Amino acid sequence: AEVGISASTNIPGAQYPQILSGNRVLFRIKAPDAKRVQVDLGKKYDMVREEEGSWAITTDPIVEGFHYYSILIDGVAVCDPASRTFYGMSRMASGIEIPEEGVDYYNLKNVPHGQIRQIRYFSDVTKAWRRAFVYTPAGYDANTSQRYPVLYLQHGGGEDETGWPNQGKMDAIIDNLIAEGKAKPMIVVMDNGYAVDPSASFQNSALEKVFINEIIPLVDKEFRTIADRDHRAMAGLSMGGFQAFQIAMTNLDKFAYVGGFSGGGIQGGDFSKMYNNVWSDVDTFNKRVKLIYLSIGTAEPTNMYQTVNNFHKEFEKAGIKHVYYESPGTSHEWLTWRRSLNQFAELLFK
Amino acid sequence: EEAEVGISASTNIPGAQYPQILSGNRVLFRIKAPDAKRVQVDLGKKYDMVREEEGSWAITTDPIVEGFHYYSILIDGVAVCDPASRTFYGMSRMASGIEIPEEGVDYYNLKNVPHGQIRQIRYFSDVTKAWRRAFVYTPAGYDANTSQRYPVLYLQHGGGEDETGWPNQGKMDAIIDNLIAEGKAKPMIVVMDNGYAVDPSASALEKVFINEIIPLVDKEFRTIADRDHRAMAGLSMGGFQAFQIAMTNLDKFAYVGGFSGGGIIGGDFSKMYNNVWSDVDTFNKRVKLIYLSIGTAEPTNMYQTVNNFHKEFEKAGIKHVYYESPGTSHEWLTWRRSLNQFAELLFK
Ligand SMILES: [Cl-]
């Protein structure tokens, strides 16, 4: 087709890319001297030369949600000049948003809004400056005798602490849930899933030390938190989900809620003994933990699906109580993770 | 002749070796692009890289001036972000940037001092009927000192940039944190918004500031909401906007700053901004501070505009501070220096 709507991820003033009927995407770029121009969106497409040095292609229908993508000039993968950038795939990378019909819980609404703030701290573990983003709920500044539970929320491999604020649209998701009475007012802390102890010789003891010895005490000191395990949760996507289980299950005195979004799991050991025998007494474990949540997209790559799905099945066989969610029609991509946060946050602190 | 090694720039993404800053502040770029026909880097000027053995291209630049520089990689003439570097919103797109340090200069670096916070606030504008976003710096101790109220600086970016400019390119939180911690600047709130506003039914930006941003900040934050505790400043375009908005709303502002911008004009300088300073002597008692800055190395047209604005102020007897930033051009180090100076003068 030809008439379309500019993607919401376009830089201001950029009319292309445009989403056509059927969620095909029309890409254009001016590159008169280029030898090859491709777009990598689900798969690689060669653009075709058009008039006055421009190239264009119309993709197959693109599945609804958020997708990283690249323009390739002569095989060199780069950010599209026409789109915003995100930290993903271990660099700055383009992303494109394909709207869902009749879904708007991750969109901005005229409801009371929280705030995402940037906090900087020097880590003694890593001997480096670090940065976290902290969501506070609407009315935080005025309700000075109110305190709040805290969710610690982590990004995936190749991403960083800007992931949930940007790709994850987390402030809209949480703003809307709280405004509709579906989630309790809560603080959300988004840090970086990488940590290097320079003196040291998906498990990372440095990251665990950073969380337990630095981030949690800092957040509990700078914010009006309810600083106990019944009001503290940890969750993450992919790598961050493995980290959430590793850190929470070896520090159950600090957390009663844990979530893995397309992450978590593992001959594979003696499942009975995972995380230093944390659930070797299943009955006691089930009453220590208020929530274990696992999610996966139905369309994820087979080995990713199997890892989380087999984790789910081991919980069933052992009788470990948990919530299990398959996101219909999505893969190892951010819409799976927005859906997961939406469900998980509704379950927290109840 | 032989190859060299250097220090990876602080703007590199984690693990990325290049660019490296060599001795003399020459910069070494090296990129894998085996199937490309031409690879260039645009940093001050364009350089052609030389294809090496395994499809790697490399070039060493001339000495690069200290400070922050936008740059691009060009593959077959297509200007893109360098995959090796972080990105910034500038030149009306996402673009690479590179930082070249100044030895012994660190007022814009992170120090072990009490730190403020930059927070994101959203609001829906009646003028533009679109969701907008501002970044608001609150000084160290803001949450704990609930009885304290604060003066406010409205701080604007340049043409082709956006509200992320001062937090990122500007390193503004380090600059203000450090001034406050050293007792050189009073504790203050800094508001950074977007310098573009379009009325869909069609100044729109002036109404956004006067009717939306300032009332929103005064309601959401513990501000001292009067002109003696409200300032406005900006760089390039943002400096022109600061003068236009503040000079037509002097009831709202007592301090105004233009960093490489501000000099609207062969006419009657005495009549500018609807005769705001026609009576020079009452103007000088109404305004606490006029600040103008420029880099000595800025393009001639840009230097003359600000310098001539300053000289018109001098002829008319209008009190103001004028600073020429030595050796810097129309680039962010000039504006980091300006904010450092300007914030010291505010609310005193
Ligand atoms: Cl991962």
XYZ file of C-alpha atoms and ligand atoms in Angstrom:
699
model
C 0.000 0.000 0.000
C 1.026 3.659 0.210
C -0.886 5.655 2.856
C 0.200 4.918 6.415
C 0.707 6.264 9.920
C 4.139 7.366 11.141
C 5.422 5.109 13.907
C 5.396 6.657 17.378
C 9.117 5.837 17.640
C 9.954 8.147 14.696
C 12.131 11.125 15.563
C 10.048 14.344 15.508
C 9.389 15.402 11.929
C 10.265 12.037 10.359
C 7.278 10.795 8.343
C 8.854 7.381 7.626
C 8.778 4.644 8.731
C 5.003 4.358 8.317
C 2.756 1.517 9.430
C 0.518 0.430 6.556
C -2.675 -1.618 6.583
C -2.011 -5.135 7.858
C 0.852 -3.773 10.007
C 3.261 -3.844 7.107
C 5.967 -1.214 7.613
C 7.194 1.050 4.807
C 10.821 2.124 5.297
C 12.490 4.897 3.290
C 16.013 6.282 3.416
C 18.081 8.599 1.207
C 21.435 6.930 0.423
C 22.418 7.805 -3.161
C 25.964 6.331 -3.014
C 25.136 3.162 -1.032
C 25.801 -0.292 -2.526
C 23.327 -2.210 -0.335
C 20.557 -0.988 1.966
C 18.697 -3.426 4.199
C 16.329 -3.243 7.137
C 16.521 -5.996 9.764
C 13.055 -6.216 11.362
C 12.284 -9.829 12.272
C 14.248 -10.750 9.146
C 16.473 -8.902 6.692
C 14.851 -7.112 3.737
C 16.738 -5.545 0.851
C 15.490 -2.084 0.050
C 15.108 -1.178 -3.642
C 16.456 1.961 -5.312
C 13.877 4.630 -6.096
C 14.003 8.162 -7.465
C 16.738 10.672 -6.626
C 18.887 8.453 -4.454
C 16.205 7.125 -2.090
C 15.627 3.478 -1.173
C 12.410 1.858 0.061
C 10.874 -1.435 1.143
C 7.539 -2.649 2.524
C 7.939 -5.465 5.038
C 5.713 -8.461 5.695
C 3.098 -7.844 8.416
C 4.944 -7.060 11.653
C 3.574 -8.498 14.890
C 2.119 -5.945 17.295
C 4.402 -4.636 20.011
C 7.923 -3.245 20.311
C 10.805 -4.425 18.119
C 14.457 -3.543 17.959
C 15.621 -3.126 14.395
C 18.604 -1.999 12.350
C 19.359 -0.379 9.029
C 22.309 -2.069 7.303
C 24.422 -0.013 4.905
C 26.643 -2.409 2.951
C 26.175 -4.947 5.727
C 27.004 -2.515 8.565
C 24.231 -2.585 11.170
C 23.389 0.916 12.465
C 20.675 3.036 14.033
C 18.089 4.324 11.586
C 18.456 8.143 11.413
C 14.661 8.331 11.300
C 13.973 6.643 14.658
C 14.612 7.086 18.363
C 17.292 4.917 19.947
C 17.329 2.438 22.818
C 20.083 0.525 24.583
C 19.548 -3.044 23.387
C 21.571 -5.778 21.713
C 24.574 -4.355 23.642
C 24.594 -0.978 21.822
C 22.343 1.913 20.940
C 19.776 0.544 18.504
C 16.600 1.612 16.762
C 13.205 0.409 17.878
C 9.783 0.538 16.289
C 6.374 0.405 17.956
C 3.469 -1.393 16.261
C 0.197 -0.562 18.097
C -2.197 -3.262 19.275
C -5.863 -2.796 18.517
C -7.898 -2.075 21.632
C -4.983 -2.160 24.107
C -3.762 0.963 25.882
C -2.578 0.091 29.422
C 1.004 1.111 28.465
C -0.132 4.430 26.977
C -0.259 7.788 28.727
C -3.659 8.670 30.169
C -5.136 11.614 32.046
C -4.638 9.932 35.426
C -2.413 10.957 38.371
C 1.191 10.342 37.367
C 4.179 9.170 39.329
C 7.709 10.267 38.500
C 10.844 8.460 37.374
C 13.955 9.946 38.927
C 17.634 9.340 38.320
C 19.818 8.502 41.332
C 23.628 8.264 41.245
C 25.797 6.390 43.730
C 29.402 5.212 43.950
C 29.748 1.443 44.378
C 32.463 0.157 46.693
C 32.037 -3.290 45.131
C 32.664 -2.142 41.575
C 34.708 0.997 42.434
C 32.647 2.844 39.844
C 29.776 5.301 39.650
C 26.392 3.684 39.047
C 22.933 4.947 38.157
C 19.446 3.720 38.958
C 16.013 4.953 37.991
C 13.421 5.084 40.781
C 9.711 5.360 40.037
C 7.711 6.988 42.816
C 3.907 6.799 42.663
C 1.546 9.723 42.243
C 1.197 11.874 45.345
C 4.504 10.629 46.793
C 5.698 14.150 47.619
C 2.504 15.173 49.450
C 1.696 11.999 51.440
C 4.721 12.461 53.675
C 3.561 10.047 56.395
C 2.842 7.311 53.825
C 5.483 4.700 53.031
C 5.620 2.300 50.114
C 6.641 -1.235 49.163
C 9.412 -1.575 46.583
C 9.756 -3.663 43.424
C 13.302 -4.167 42.128
C 12.927 -4.574 38.363
C 15.743 -5.677 36.041
C 16.392 -5.578 32.285
C 17.687 -8.346 30.012
C 21.075 -9.162 28.556
C 22.387 -6.478 26.238
C 20.158 -3.840 27.879
C 20.633 -1.365 30.732
C 18.771 0.549 33.448
C 17.055 2.721 30.816
C 15.185 -0.356 29.519
C 12.071 -0.460 31.674
C 11.506 3.349 31.539
C 11.771 3.411 27.730
C 11.175 0.064 25.960
C 9.104 -1.035 28.950
C 6.886 2.075 29.191
C 6.874 1.207 32.863
C 5.584 4.515 34.223
C 2.413 4.275 32.114
C 1.839 0.635 33.088
C 2.263 1.325 36.808
C 0.514 4.748 36.739
C -2.533 3.178 35.099
C -2.664 0.127 37.387
C -2.481 2.312 40.492
C -5.050 4.781 39.151
C -7.524 1.972 38.381
C -7.036 0.479 41.863
C -5.535 -2.699 40.386
C -2.094 -2.357 41.998
C -1.059 -0.933 45.334
C 0.961 2.297 45.271
C 4.560 1.163 45.042
C 8.109 2.332 44.364
C 10.019 0.643 41.522
C 13.842 0.528 41.340
C 15.564 -0.157 37.994
C 19.339 -0.696 38.154
C 21.990 -2.159 35.841
C 22.354 -5.926 35.615
C 26.142 -5.749 35.148
C 28.684 -5.436 37.936
C 32.450 -6.058 37.889
C 34.425 -6.431 41.109
C 37.875 -5.285 39.913
C 39.617 -7.246 42.688
C 37.773 -10.513 42.005
C 39.111 -13.802 40.655
C 23.916 -15.904 34.829
C 25.213 -15.854 38.400
C 27.253 -12.832 39.546
C 28.305 -12.464 43.181
C 29.354 -8.831 42.569
C 25.867 -7.901 41.382
C 24.347 -9.699 44.381
C 26.603 -7.726 46.742
C 25.698 -4.475 44.980
C 21.990 -5.178 45.478
C 22.106 -6.426 49.052
C 24.844 -4.147 50.395
C 24.396 -0.964 48.327
C 21.150 -0.531 46.354
C 18.620 -1.752 48.929
C 20.160 0.258 51.827
C 20.412 3.336 49.612
C 16.797 3.095 48.474
C 15.533 2.417 52.014
C 17.464 5.471 53.220
C 16.586 7.977 50.465
C 12.955 6.974 49.952
C 9.951 6.436 52.213
C 9.930 2.674 51.846
C 8.423 -0.125 53.887
C 11.776 -1.799 54.466
C 10.946 -5.433 55.123
C 10.599 -8.617 53.086
C 6.794 -8.584 52.983
C 7.038 -5.266 51.125
C 10.013 -6.049 48.882
C 9.896 -7.770 45.486
C 12.417 -8.572 42.760
C 11.729 -9.378 39.120
C 13.411 -9.172 35.751
C 13.257 -10.218 32.126
C 15.537 -12.824 30.503
C 18.964 -12.405 32.173
C 17.288 -10.195 34.790
C 14.854 -12.996 35.596
C 17.694 -15.414 36.273
C 19.214 -12.700 38.472
C 15.955 -12.087 40.331
C 15.700 -15.774 41.257
C 19.392 -16.020 42.137
C 19.363 -12.924 44.338
C 15.937 -13.391 45.929
C 16.308 -17.114 46.564
C 19.668 -16.638 48.301
C 18.289 -13.697 50.322
C 14.770 -14.809 51.235
C 15.115 -12.760 54.420
C 14.949 -9.715 52.131
C 12.223 -10.642 49.584
C 8.848 -12.372 49.602
C 7.981 -11.886 45.905
C 9.992 -12.963 42.874
C 9.244 -12.848 39.144
C 11.011 -14.140 36.046
C 9.816 -12.841 32.656
C 11.252 -15.179 29.966
C 14.077 -15.922 32.406
C 14.627 -18.274 35.304
C 15.451 -21.958 35.335
C 18.505 -24.070 34.655
C 21.974 -32.773 33.888
C 20.534 -29.624 35.332
C 21.328 -30.605 38.907
C 19.028 -32.111 41.498
C 16.224 -29.519 41.309
C 15.462 -30.304 44.958
C 18.806 -28.678 45.839
C 18.694 -25.509 43.711
C 19.839 -22.248 45.360
C 21.540 -23.883 48.366
C 18.525 -26.066 49.256
C 16.205 -23.054 49.543
C 13.131 -25.203 48.820
C 14.283 -28.584 50.164
C 11.409 -28.267 52.669
C 8.683 -27.404 50.158
C 5.946 -26.867 52.768
C 7.999 -24.392 54.800
C 9.195 -22.695 51.586
C 5.631 -22.236 50.308
C 4.720 -20.280 53.433
C 7.897 -18.161 53.403
C 7.245 -16.927 49.842
C 4.177 -14.877 48.971
C 4.588 -15.079 45.176
C 6.656 -16.850 42.539
C 5.785 -15.727 39.013
C 7.030 -17.090 35.692
C 6.070 -15.930 32.207
C 7.091 -16.730 28.636
C 5.786 -15.807 25.211
C 4.084 -18.606 23.312
C 6.214 -17.765 20.245
C 9.635 -17.516 21.914
C 12.610 -19.418 20.453
C 12.295 -23.076 21.403
C 15.270 -23.213 23.763
C 14.123 -20.075 25.583
C 10.551 -21.389 25.866
C 11.766 -24.787 27.106
C 14.039 -23.255 29.766
C 11.230 -21.328 31.441
C 8.543 -23.914 30.681
C 10.660 -26.713 32.191
C 11.253 -24.522 35.269
C 7.477 -24.220 35.584
C 7.108 -28.000 35.281
C 9.741 -28.673 37.950
C 7.795 -26.374 40.277
C 4.646 -28.382 39.535
C 6.348 -31.719 40.187
C 7.821 -30.445 43.455
C 4.551 -28.818 44.467
C 6.091 -25.343 44.673
C 3.239 -22.839 44.401
C 3.627 -20.261 41.631
C 1.801 -18.324 38.923
C 2.546 -19.218 35.303
C 1.632 -17.048 32.314
C 2.081 -17.604 28.574
C 1.799 -14.370 26.606
C -0.323 -15.173 23.517
C 1.410 -14.704 20.185
C 4.538 -12.847 21.335
C 8.193 -13.805 21.400
C 11.365 -12.832 23.318
C 10.488 -9.151 22.967
C 9.256 -6.268 25.052
C 5.470 -6.706 24.641
C 5.840 -10.045 26.456
C 7.551 -8.129 29.232
C 5.058 -5.235 29.408
C 2.286 -7.835 29.675
C 4.231 -9.641 32.398
C 4.799 -6.496 34.462
C 1.123 -5.608 34.151
C 0.054 -8.970 35.625
C 2.880 -9.220 38.167
C 2.392 -5.756 39.665
C -1.307 -6.468 40.274
C -0.324 -9.474 42.401
C 2.252 -7.662 44.546
C 1.940 -6.785 48.231
C -1.439 -8.434 48.754
C 53.318 5.008 9.855
C 53.152 2.666 12.848
C 49.931 2.171 14.763
C 49.258 3.801 18.129
C 47.124 3.094 21.190
C 45.176 5.354 23.503
C 42.401 5.786 26.060
C 38.854 4.762 25.131
C 36.578 7.794 25.278
C 34.090 7.979 28.147
C 31.258 8.212 25.586
C 32.051 4.720 24.242
C 29.500 2.019 24.971
C 30.663 -0.590 27.529
C 33.437 -2.771 26.139
C 33.873 -0.710 22.965
C 37.581 -0.112 22.345
C 37.263 2.750 19.792
C 37.333 5.707 19.590
C 40.561 6.080 21.533
C 42.063 9.423 22.520
C 45.752 9.444 21.590
C 48.505 11.766 22.739
C 47.870 15.311 21.554
C 44.114 14.607 21.726
C 44.128 13.067 18.269
C 41.360 10.442 18.033
C 41.758 6.921 16.619
C 38.642 5.379 15.013
C 38.522 1.763 13.828
C 35.394 0.007 12.497
C 34.678 -3.372 10.856
C 32.893 -2.817 7.525
C 34.337 -5.405 5.123
C 31.671 -4.887 2.409
C 31.631 -1.079 2.479
C 32.897 1.034 -0.403
C 33.685 4.138 1.677
C 33.887 4.851 5.431
C 34.266 8.357 6.886
C 34.109 10.019 10.307
C 32.771 13.584 10.640
C 34.381 15.121 13.737
C 35.092 18.808 13.207
C 35.605 17.900 9.548
C 35.217 14.758 7.461
C 38.040 12.214 7.350
C 38.258 9.240 5.019
C 39.198 6.012 6.822
C 41.703 3.602 5.206
C 40.675 -0.035 4.678
C 42.983 -2.359 6.681
C 43.623 -6.163 6.435
C 40.446 -7.961 7.644
C 37.888 -5.397 6.430
C 38.643 -2.992 9.276
C 38.796 0.717 8.463
C 40.792 3.176 10.546
C 41.809 6.804 10.717
C 43.519 9.093 13.194
C 42.099 12.617 13.304
C 43.780 15.980 13.799
C 44.004 17.055 17.456
C 40.444 17.498 18.730
C 39.625 20.471 20.952
C 38.815 19.548 24.543
C 35.126 19.231 25.423
C 32.038 17.566 23.926
C 31.528 17.047 20.187
C 28.697 15.600 18.168
C 30.026 13.324 15.441
C 28.881 10.890 12.768
C 30.176 7.885 10.898
C 29.433 7.859 7.177
C 29.048 4.559 5.336
C 28.948 5.247 1.580
C 28.019 8.852 2.375
C 25.185 7.928 4.790
C 25.611 9.743 8.117
C 24.707 7.499 11.070
C 25.370 6.939 14.751
C 28.639 5.161 15.490
C 27.732 1.658 16.777
C 30.561 2.091 19.304
C 29.279 5.209 21.088
C 26.336 6.359 23.112
C 23.802 8.649 21.458
C 22.444 12.116 22.143
C 19.555 14.060 20.646
C 21.232 16.747 18.543
C 21.171 18.035 14.986
C 17.442 17.029 15.078
C 18.197 13.309 15.341
C 19.951 10.790 17.523
C 23.686 11.328 16.987
C 26.965 10.094 18.406
C 28.981 12.230 20.760
C 32.570 12.095 21.985
C 34.052 13.577 25.171
C 37.650 14.889 25.178
C 38.741 15.578 28.786
C 40.452 18.697 30.141
C 43.242 17.763 32.536
C 42.627 19.135 36.024
C 39.087 20.339 35.165
C 36.291 18.408 36.866
C 33.425 20.712 37.927
C 31.199 18.728 35.502
C 32.325 15.307 36.811
C 30.716 13.170 39.501
C 32.227 13.765 42.935
C 31.646 12.299 46.390
C 29.301 15.131 47.388
C 25.600 15.226 48.304
C 23.711 14.685 45.060
C 20.479 16.117 43.740
C 18.095 14.185 41.536
C 16.849 14.696 37.984
C 13.242 13.568 37.699
C 10.964 13.153 34.711
C 7.563 14.811 34.897
C 4.823 14.504 32.301
C 1.980 16.883 31.593
C -0.663 17.319 28.908
C -0.506 20.719 27.240
C -3.666 22.610 26.334
C -1.676 24.735 23.867
C -0.354 21.754 21.887
C -2.948 19.104 22.916
C -0.018 16.708 23.232
C 1.777 15.009 26.097
C 4.969 16.844 27.084
C 7.915 15.968 29.304
C 10.211 18.094 31.472
C 13.225 17.096 33.541
C 13.397 18.713 36.974
C 16.548 18.780 39.069
C 15.917 19.007 42.789
C 18.952 19.783 44.971
C 20.480 17.483 47.554
C 18.329 17.102 50.658
C 15.115 18.152 48.890
C 12.965 15.258 50.122
C 14.163 15.505 53.735
C 13.906 19.300 54.177
C 10.136 19.527 53.786
C 10.032 23.023 55.313
C 12.482 24.424 52.750
C 11.400 26.113 49.522
C 13.631 26.804 46.545
C 14.245 29.287 43.731
C 13.892 27.951 40.192
C 15.972 28.246 37.015
C 14.267 27.440 33.699
C 17.057 26.125 31.473
C 16.655 25.561 27.728
C 18.493 23.617 25.013
C 19.498 24.753 21.513
C 18.077 24.287 18.053
C 17.851 20.650 17.004
C 18.116 19.419 20.614
C 15.490 18.555 23.237
C 14.837 18.426 26.994
C 17.388 15.583 27.396
C 20.213 17.942 26.374
C 21.117 19.581 29.661
C 20.956 16.306 31.668
C 23.166 14.498 29.141
C 25.373 16.690 26.893
C 25.157 19.314 29.643
C 26.152 17.118 32.618
C 24.023 19.599 34.499
C 23.530 17.548 37.665
C 27.277 17.303 38.270
C 27.661 21.029 37.595
C 24.913 22.083 39.993
C 25.644 19.391 42.624
C 29.234 20.573 42.800
C 28.466 24.304 42.962
C 25.944 23.765 45.745
C 28.232 21.439 47.705
C 31.079 23.970 47.479
C 28.834 26.833 48.632
C 29.260 28.700 45.302
C 25.570 28.469 44.332
C 22.409 28.531 46.399
C 20.275 25.366 46.513
C 17.945 25.618 43.534
C 15.492 23.703 41.351
C 16.275 23.529 37.616
C 13.512 22.938 35.051
C 14.459 21.667 31.583
C 11.664 21.526 29.000
C 11.327 21.295 25.205
C 11.894 24.437 23.144
C 9.357 23.556 20.451
C 5.580 23.899 20.706
C 3.035 23.569 17.887
C -0.609 24.589 18.242
C -2.515 21.998 16.149
C -5.226 24.575 15.395
C -2.725 27.097 13.981
C 3.793 32.362 20.543
C 2.717 28.827 21.428
C 5.915 28.173 23.395
C 5.468 31.336 25.460
C 1.975 30.234 26.501
C 3.299 26.788 27.394
C 5.839 28.374 29.732
C 3.604 31.012 31.291
C 0.324 29.098 31.355
C 1.513 25.505 31.869
C 5.126 24.852 32.914
C 5.591 27.576 35.545
C 2.203 26.906 37.231
C 2.885 23.148 37.142
C 6.319 23.482 38.775
C 5.036 25.919 41.402
C 2.294 23.459 42.341
C 4.271 20.192 42.225
C 7.471 21.456 43.876
C 8.227 23.570 46.946
C 9.245 26.674 45.019
C 9.609 30.303 46.022
C 7.121 31.507 43.414
C 8.132 35.088 42.731
C 10.328 36.926 40.257
C 13.183 37.401 42.732
C 13.467 33.599 42.867
C 12.846 32.748 39.198
C 15.428 32.805 36.399
C 15.458 31.737 32.749
C 18.425 30.894 30.540
C 19.184 28.928 27.407
C 21.778 28.147 24.781
C 21.637 29.323 21.152
C 17.907 29.127 20.244
C 17.116 28.614 23.937
C 18.918 31.840 24.782
C 16.854 33.763 22.243
C 13.776 32.168 23.843
C 14.933 33.072 27.361
C 15.228 36.748 26.445
C 11.951 36.820 24.496
C 9.964 35.105 27.252
C 11.589 36.806 30.234
C 11.678 40.303 28.720
C 7.947 40.103 27.922
C 7.174 38.606 31.367
C 9.439 40.657 33.645
C 6.782 40.302 36.342
C 7.829 36.628 36.432
C 11.642 36.762 36.174
C 14.473 38.803 37.650
C 17.394 36.894 36.025
C 18.018 36.135 32.340
C 20.849 34.302 30.601
C 21.814 33.809 26.980
C 24.583 31.321 26.182
C 25.670 31.893 22.555
C 22.253 33.405 21.857
C 19.972 36.318 22.601
C 20.689 39.222 20.235
C 17.485 39.967 18.310
C 17.945 42.643 15.654
C 19.392 48.114 11.943
C 16.659 49.459 14.182
C 16.071 51.136 17.535
C 17.725 48.987 20.202
C 15.949 51.086 22.834
C 12.579 49.670 21.672
C 13.318 45.923 21.866
C 10.832 43.584 23.562
C 8.126 46.264 23.544
C 10.167 49.033 25.196
C 11.148 46.791 28.117
C 14.296 48.853 28.783
C 13.368 52.187 27.202
C 13.675 53.610 30.732
C 17.132 52.205 31.427
C 17.379 53.302 35.054
C 14.177 51.623 36.227
C 15.059 48.546 34.161
C 18.414 48.242 35.935
C 16.631 48.157 39.304
C 13.958 45.713 38.094
C 16.422 43.123 36.723
C 18.821 41.360 39.047
C 20.984 39.813 36.315
C 21.480 39.822 32.553
C 24.124 37.292 31.469
C 25.575 36.761 27.990
C 28.293 34.352 26.921
C 30.021 33.245 23.733
C 32.945 31.055 22.750
C 35.945 32.851 21.278
C 36.100 30.216 18.519
C 32.421 30.332 17.488
C 31.536 31.024 13.834
C 31.950 34.724 13.088
C 28.230 35.326 12.576
C 27.420 33.790 15.967
C 30.130 35.683 17.855
C 29.147 39.033 16.328
C 25.464 38.605 17.231
C 26.165 38.134 20.934
C 29.097 40.547 21.110
C 27.037 43.260 19.385
C 24.145 42.564 21.780
C 26.592 43.021 24.671
C 27.967 46.230 23.144
C 24.467 47.670 22.698
C 23.857 46.946 26.386
C 27.118 48.751 27.190
C 26.251 51.859 25.159
C 22.777 52.085 26.718
C 24.159 51.660 30.225
C 22.221 48.420 30.805
C 23.963 46.412 33.544
C 24.964 42.888 32.466
C 27.600 40.185 32.737
C 29.483 39.198 29.560
C 31.804 36.184 29.366
C 33.918 34.980 26.463
C 34.742 31.259 26.811
C 38.390 30.840 25.737
C 39.105 28.398 22.939
C 35.631 26.879 22.635
C 33.100 27.090 19.837
C 29.347 26.600 19.344
C 29.473 23.397 21.377
C 28.509 22.059 24.770
C 31.694 22.877 26.723
C 30.910 26.566 26.127
C 27.481 26.000 27.651
C 28.727 23.907 30.581
C 31.084 26.802 31.401
C 28.217 29.295 31.076
C 25.892 27.399 33.396
C 28.714 27.054 35.924
C 29.173 30.842 35.930
C 25.473 31.741 35.637
C 24.290 29.507 38.476
C 26.847 31.109 40.819
C 25.249 34.516 40.212
C 21.618 33.500 40.756
C 19.275 34.433 43.601
C 21.761 36.641 45.446
Cl 19.336 -12.197 28.371
